[PDB]
Amino acid sequence: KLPEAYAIFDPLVDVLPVIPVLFLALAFVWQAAVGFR
């Protein structure tokens, strides 16, 4: 039930919920680059 027009975003809309996890994972890439000061 995603209004037709937007239905060209299904694939994207399907992935959005996971993004937040990524942040915690990116925060680890950050410290890795900064050598865990």
Ligand X SMILES: CC1=C(/C=C/C(C)=C/C=C/C(C)=C/C=C/C=C(C)/C=C/C=C(C)/C=C/C2=C(C)CCCC2(C)C)C(C)(C)CCC1
Termini Cα distance of the chain:
48
29 near ligand CLA (CB under 6 A): no
In Å, what is the CA distance from 17 to each residue of 20, 22, 30, 32? 7, 10, 22, 25
Site string (1-37) toward other proteins, x via CB under 8 A: xxxxxx-x-x-xxx-xx-xx--x-----x-xxx-xxx
Question: What does the CA dihedral 16, 19, 20, 21 come to, rounded to 10 degrees?
Answer: 130
Judged by CB under 6 A, the residue of 30, 34, 35, 37 near ligand X is: 30
Binding site for other proteins (CB under 8 A): 1-6, 8, 10, 12-14, 16-17, 19-20, 23, 29, 31-33, 35-37
